[PDB]
C-alpha cells in the first residue's frame, strides 16, 4: 500500500536486515540506546532471559473417596467381579486387595515412563535451543552428568525394569495405565514453533504397597527427586528395589498376578516396551495437554508420616482399605494446602473462589472439556484442626481426578553472571511479602511465565496490602466453575479411568 | 481413545455443558469456593473484569529535521518543483510555505476523521461487548450523551469540517495522507473474534498554522480532548475554528491550493469521507497495525509554551521556519521523556536500554519490518539543560517516524460498585512507588495489558527496588534492535512517506 | 413470539447451557447466593438429597 | 444392576432387601448355588398356575 | 524372563547356574557386552563347524 517500497527494493532490503532468531537457552543482553545511563544503574534492565522448561510435578490419584460409592470401590467391585467369578480366581483376597494391587502397578508404570524420559532426553542436543538437555535433566532431579557419563548403565536399568516389570499383571484397556504413562513420557512444546517452550510432568511422589496382614493394606508415599537434587543412577535403582522390595515376596500378589494374567489372558496385559541406543523423544505439539496445564490448580506439598503440622496430627496422604473400617472400603481422603512447613501458607486463601475455565477458540467439545479439567481441583471446606493451637490450613476438595498438582517448577537462566540455570518452584498462588527483594523478583517470576503459552493461572497475594489479585492469565472463552459441576467433571473422568472394557459385556 | 465416553454419551454431554461467551463490559464476581472464606476479607479475589478500549495516543511528526539536508526539506524541493512546473507563472511562495500548507492539511484531515470516529461509534452495538459505544466515546474525550442527544448537529458539523477543509488541495499520492487516514479512520480488534478488544489511535494534539509575516510561518500544537474530559459539540467546534481560522478565507493558502490543483488534478487529491446518518465502521482485523501497536513506544507529553521545564526555557514543539535561521528550514527536533510536571519521571530511565522488536512467525518480510518499527522511538542522548538546577530529565532520540507514540489510555470496568468505566493513562514505562495501594493497582494494570494481543511492551520500576525491569511481554521471534539500525528505517519511512511521483 | 431471540440466537444458546440430569444417589451442596449467609448456620438450607428407593414391606 | 446416572444402584437396594451387598458380591457363585438349589428343592412341589394368587405374588416379588 | 506364573522365572534359574542372581539384574549391559566380547575373542581360533561335538554341547549347554 505503499508505492514507495516497490519501487526501491533494495534500499528497503539493505534498511532492514536484522539478525532474527537467537538461539534460546543463553542470556542476552541488550545494551543502551542511551550510552550515558550507567550513572542509573539498575534502573536500567538491559537483561533478557527467556525460560525453557516448566514441569509439572504431579500425583497420581485413585480419585477422592470416603465410602462404597467411589469410582475406585465401583471399580474394584466391577473388576473383582471379573477376576474372581467370571474367570474361577482363588479366594485368599478381596476387591480392595486386588484395586490395591492395581493402583501399585500404576506406580510402577509411572517410574519406568519416568526413567525412560530421563534416558530419551540426554541424548537431544540442538543448535537452536541450549536447553536441551540439560535443564530438562535438572528438573526432573538427576545430574545431567552421570546420564551421560553412565549412558549404558541407565539405559539397561531402564530395560531391566520393564522386563522385572513382566512379573506382574495388569490390564491393558483400563486407561488409567495408558493416560499416566502418557502424560509421564512426553515433552510438549507450548506454541509449535523452533525454539519454544518445554512442559514436562514429573512425579512428586509414587505410592509404595504397604501389607498390614489382618489390619488391611496401605499405599504409602515414596518421595521422587526434586529438580535440584542432583541424583545419580544408584539412587533411582534404590528407588525401585524400595518400590518393588513389599510386592515381589508378597504371595497375595503372586496370587494376583497369576489371577489377572488368567483373567485378561497375555495380549491384554501392560506391557512397557523395550528401548535401545537409537530410541529418541521428540518434544511434540499437544493442544489437549496445554489445555490441561492452562487450569491446572495446585494443591501443595503431599502430607507424610514425619511431616511437622500443628493441630492436625494424623493427616497424612495414604490409600487405605480396612475391612472394619467403612465397611472394607479403599478410602483416599487427602488434605490440601500443605507447603512443606509448620506454618500457613496464606497465598492458598486465594484459591478460596469459583475458578476461571478457558479455552482456545469457540467449538468446545465435550471431551474438551473433560480434558480441559483434569487437573484442575477446587476447595470446598477447612479441614477441622484437633485441638486449639493450629499453625496450618488445611482445605478438603470437592474430589479431584486421577492427578492433582503438587506444584510447578520452572528453569530459566540468571540474570547475573555466570548466567547458570535457576530454578523456581511455585504453586498457583505466589505470595509476595514486603521486602524490597520480592517484587521485582515477583515481576520476574510473572515474565518468565508469561512466556508460556497456555500457562496456569496464577494467584498473586501482597502482604503489604493484605490483598490477592485472582487469575492472571489472559482469557479467550471462560465460563465461572462452581465446585459441583466439577466434581462431575471429575466423576465421570475417574469413572472412565478404571474402566476395563477388556471385559465381554454388551454394554 | 477413551472406550467409556463412546458408551454413555449423555453423561459427557450433560455433565459438560457450561455456559461460555460472555458479555465484556460487565463486572463479573466468581463467588467462593470454599463458603467460609468471607473472614479472609481482601485475600479472595472474587473479582474479573476484563478491558476493552487501549487508544494509542499520537502526535503527528514531519520527521526529524535540523537542517536542510532533512527528509522533509528534501520533500519540499521535490514538491515544489513539481507543483512550480506545473504552474507557471509567478509565484509568491518558497519550497517551506508548500510543504508547511502540506503539513497543516494532514492536521485538518486528522480532525476530519477524529470527529467522523466519534459520529461512526455512536452507531455501534453489540449485545456481548458493554463497551460498545460509551467506552469508545470516553476514550476519544467526547461526552457520549452529547453525541446521542445531538445528533443531526453533530452530523451538520463533521460535514461541515469535510465540506470547508474538503476545499484545500493536497496530494493524493503523498502516503502521509493515507497512512494518517487508515489510522485515525479505523477501529482494531487484536483478535479476530467477537468479543474482542479495541484498539484506537487519537490524536494527541494538532498542528494549527500561524504565519509570522516576514519572520516566516510556525506549526503550533493544539491540544486535542484528552479520555473522560466529557466534552461537547461547541469544544470541537472551538478547536475547529481556530484550526482552520488563519486558512479558510485566506488570499495565500488559497493561492497554494490552487497550484496543488493544478499540478495534481482532481483524480489525484486526497479525499474526505462524509455522513449520512448510515455511516458505521467496524472493527476489522489487521496484524500489520497490531504490529506497530506491538513496537509503540511513548515518548511523553508535548511540551508546550505554557509548560514549567526547571531547567528546560525554550524546548516547546514546534514545526518553525524563520528565512534567518538554518537557512530557511523546516525545523523540527522536539525534546523527549516530558509527562506534565517538574518532578523527573524516572520510569523513562528504563527506556534507555536498547529495544526489542517481537514479531510473530519465522519468516519477517522487509516490509513488515519497515511497517513494525513505526510507532517505536528509542531515545539516544540527554537533552542538556540551561541551568545548573533542573527538575526534570528530558532526552533526543535518533529519529523518529511520522508519528510519536505519546500515552496509552486503557478503558475497563471498575471493580467496585457501581462498575462504571475506570481510565488509565501510561507510558510504556510505569513507575510503581513505593505505597500500600498501587502494588495491587499495578496487578490490575498488568493484568489488564495482558488480556491485549500484540499490546506494547512494558516497563516497570520499583520505588524501594531502585530498578526497572525490562520488556514485560510475551516473546516471539525477537531481535535487539540499536539505534543506528532504527534510524536508518526512520530515514527511509519519513522519504517514503512525503515522496511525490515526480515530472520536475 | 419473541423477535430479539430470532435476530440474536447464539446469545440465547450460550445463556442458557446449563448441566441437567444430575446423579441421584449422591448429596449435593447447592452453595450460597449471599456469600454473607454462614453467619447465618442452620437458617441456610444449602443440602440436597433426592431419595431413590421406598420398599413396600408386605405380609 | 448398575447405571452411572443413579448411584442407589445396586447397594441401596439389597439394604433395604436386608442384606449384606458386600456378602452378594464376594459370595456370588454360593449364592447362586443357594437360589437354584431353592428353586430345586421348592420347584419339586405342585402348586395350580389357574390359582392368581401364586402370580400376583411373584408379580409384586419379582419387581423393580 | 518374568511370568506371572512362574515365580521361579529367572532367580532360581540364575542360582542353578551358581550366579548372583541380583547382579545380572544390576550390571546387566556388562553381562550383555561380556558375552559378546567371549564370542569375539573366539574368533581368534578357528575349529570346524561341521564336527557335531561343538553342536552338541552348544545346544546342550544353550537350552532351557
Known amino acids: 500500500d505503499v508505492a514507495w517500497y516497490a519501487r526501491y527494493p533494495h534500499i528497503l532490503e539493505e534498511a532492514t536486515r536484522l539478525p532474527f532468531a537467537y538461539p534460546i537457552g543463553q542470556y542476552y543482553d541488550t545494551g543502551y540506546s542511551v550510552a550515558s545511563a550507567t550513572e542509573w544503574s539498575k534502573y536500567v534492565d538491559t537483561s533478557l532471559t527467556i525460560p525453557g522448561v516448566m514441569c509439572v510435578n504431579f500425583t497420581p490419584t ?14 474394584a467391585q466391577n473388576v473383582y467381579t471379573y477376576v474372581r467369578h467370571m474367570n474361577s480366581g482363588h479366594a485368599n483376597y478381596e476387591q480392595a486387595d486386588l484395586m490395591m494391587y492395581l493402583l501399585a502397578m500404576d506406580s510402577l508404570y ?8 530421563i534416558l530419551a532426553i540426554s541424548k537431544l542436543y540442538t543448535p537452536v535451543n541450549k536447553y536441551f538437555p540439560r535443564a530438562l535433566l535438572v528438573a526432573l532431579g ?53 525454539r519454544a517452550q518445554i512442559y514436562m510432568f514429573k512425579p512428586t511422589m509414587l505410592w509404595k504397597y504397604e501389607n498390614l496382614g489382618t489390619t488391611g493394606t496401605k499405599l504409602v508415599p515414596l518421595m521422587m527427586p526434586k529438580a535440584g537434587d542432583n541424583r545419580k543412577l544408584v539412587d533411582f535403582q534404590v528407588l525401585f528395589n524400595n518400590l518393588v522390595s513389599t510386592m515381589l515376596g508378597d504371595e497375595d500378589f503372586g496370587i494376583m498376578s497369576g489371577d489377572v494374567f488368567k483373567a485378561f489372558g497375555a495380549d491384554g496385559l501392560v506391557k512397557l516396551l523395550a528401548v535401545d541406543s537409537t530410541t529418541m523423544t521428540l ?86 472439556i473433560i480434558e ?25 476438595p470437592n474430589g479431584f481426578g486421577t492427578e492433582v498438582v503438587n506444584d510447578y517448577t520452572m528453569i530459566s537462566v540468571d540474570k547475573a553472571t555466570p548466567h547458570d540455570l535457576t530454578i523456581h518452584t511455585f504453586f498457583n ?51 465461572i466453575l462452581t465446585g459441583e459441576t466439577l466434581a462431575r467433571m471429575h466423576e465421570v473422568c475417574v469413572t472412565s479411568m478404571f474402566d476395563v472394557p477388556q471385559m465381554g459385556f454388551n454394554k
Request: glycine share 6%.
Open 110 to 117: 509411572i517410574f519406568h515412563s519416568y526413567v525412560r524420559k
Open 429 to 479: 498462588n505466589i505470595l509476595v511479602p514486603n521486602a524490597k527483594e520480592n517484587y521485582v523478583a515477583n515481576l520476574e517470576l510473572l515474565n518468565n511465565i508469561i512466556q508460556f503459552d497456555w500457562a496456569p493461572q496464577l494467584y498473586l497475594t501482597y502482604g503489604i496490602a493484605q490483598e490477592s489479585f485472582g487469575p492472571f492469565a489472559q482469557l479467550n472463552d471462560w465460563t
Open 283 to 368: 518434544p511434540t505439539y499437544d493442544p489437549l495437554i496445554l489445555a490441561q496445564i492452562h487450569s491446572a490448580r495446585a494443591v501443595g506439598a503431599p502430607i507424610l508420616e514425619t511431616s511437622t503440622l500443628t493441630g492436625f496430627p494424623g493427616r497424612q496422604w495414604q490409600i487405605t482399605q480396612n475391612p472394619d473400617v467403612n465397611n472394607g472400603a479403599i478410602i483416599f481422603h487427602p488434605s490440601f494446602g500443605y507447603d512443606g512447613q509448620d506454618h500457613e501458607e496464606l497465598s492458598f486463601r486465594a484459591m478460596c473462589s469459583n475458578m476461571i475455565l478457558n479455552l482456545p477458540g469457540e467449538a468446545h467439545s465435550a471431551e474438551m
Open 142 to 194: 538427576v545430574d545431567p552428568e552421570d546420564v551421560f557419563a553412565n549412558q549404558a548403565q541407565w539405559e539397561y536399568f531402564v530395560n531391566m525394569v520393564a522386563y522385572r516389570a513382566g512379573a506382574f499383571a495388569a490390564p491393558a484397556s483400563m486407561t488409567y495405565y495408558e493416560r499416566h504413562a502418557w502424560m509421564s513420557n512426553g515433552l510438549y512444546v507450548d506454541q509449535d514453533v523452533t
Open 372 to 396: 480441559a479439567t483434569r487437573l484442575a481441583t477446587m476447595f470446598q471446606v477447612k479441614a477441622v484442626p484437633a485441638g486449639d493451637t493450629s499453625k496450618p490450613v488445611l482445605y478438603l
Open 62 to 75: 485413585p480419585g477422592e473417596s470416603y465410602n462404597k460409592n467411589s469410582p475406585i470401590n465401583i471399580a
